[PDB]
Amino acid sequence: MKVGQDKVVTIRYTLQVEGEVLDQGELSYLHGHRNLIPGLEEALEGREEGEAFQAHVPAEKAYGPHDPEGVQVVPLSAFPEDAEVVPGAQFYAQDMEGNPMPLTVVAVEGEEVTVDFNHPLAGKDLDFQVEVVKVREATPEELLHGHAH
Amino acid sequence: PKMKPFIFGA
Amino acid sequence: MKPFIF
Ligand SMILES: [Cl-]
């Protein structure tokens, strides 16, 4: 079976950014439903089970470019009393629909904390080594939910 | 007077 | 979108 619209595809992968492996493992996803970064999904289109390959995915087809609007300055009083507010530390605010908005602390200057709401890989080009482990048809429930079980 | 935090640990 | 990177 080939990778295609409405297939649930299982891959084993290694994610490299700038010559360093950042993540490694296995995932399954419903193909053609915006469940996987588009560059990788494009590289997977039409592949057979058992196929292995490498794929370079520029930032625009991966987690997207770095959005300057994602960088903001907030007061230190915005953070929990106990928290260590340091570069790299992660937290979340809430969007207008009540959902979590993760952020990373970028810099702390006295009372001014610069945070970044961007995906940590936004604006980075990715390199994948991929193996297609399994391809199957989605169940109706998976199509209704929009994701692999 | 201390402001209600709008940033949460996770 | 996947891969989920924390
Ligand atoms: Cl999925």
Keywords:
heterotrimer, A: 149 residues, mainly beta, Chitinase A, domain 3, four-stranded antiparallel sheet, 9% helix, B: 10 residues, 0% helix, rod-shaped, binds chloride ion, isomerase, chaperone, FKBP domain, IF domain, chaperone
Write up this protein:
The complex is a heterotrimer, with 1 copy of chain A (149 residues) and 2 copies of chain B. By secondary structure, chain A is mainly β. In chain A, the strands form 2 sheets. Chain A has a 4-stranded antiparallel β-sheet with strand order 2-1-8-3. A 4-stranded antiparallel β-sheet of chain A has the order 4-7-6-5, with no helix packed on it. Chain A starts with 6 loop residues before the first strand and ends with a helix. Chain A has one domain: Chitinase A, domain 3. Chain A is built from 2 helices and 8 strands, in the order E-E-H-E-E-E-E-E-E-H. Chain B is rod-shaped, with a radius of gyration of 8 Å. Chain B contains no helices and 1 strand. Chain B is mainly β. Chain B is 0% helix and 20% strand. The A-B interface holds A 74-75, 77-81, 83, 90-94, 100, 102-103, 115 and B 2-3, 5-10. The site of chloride ion has 5 residues of chain A, from strand 2. Chloride ion is lined by residues 29-30, 35, 147-148 of chain A. The PDB classes it as isomerase, chaperone. Keywords: chaperone, PPIase, isomerase. The assembly is trimeric. Structure of SlyD from Thermus thermophilus in complex with S2-W23A peptide. Chain A: Peptidyl-prolyl cis-trans isomerase SlyD.
State the share of residues found in helices of chain B, binned by percent.
Answer: under 10%
Report the structural category of chain A. mainly beta
* Order of neighbouring strands in the sheet with most strands of chain A: 2-1-8-3
Of all protein chain pairs, which has the greatest interface, and how many residues does each chain bring to it?
Answer: A-B, 17 and 8 residues
How many whole angstroms does the radius of gyration of chain A measure?
19 Å
CATH class of chain A: Alpha Beta
Percent of residues in beta strands of chain A: 35-45%
Quickly count the domains of chain A.
Answer: 1
The ordered H/E elements of chain A are: EEHEEEEEEH
Multimeric status of the protein: heterotrimer
Major pleated sheet of chain A: 4 strands, antiparallel
PDB class: isomerase, chaperone
Keywords: FKBP domain, IF domain, chaperone, peptidyl-prolyl isomerase, PPIase, isomerase
Assembly: trimeric
Entry title: Structure of SlyD from Thermus thermophilus in complex with S2-W23A peptide
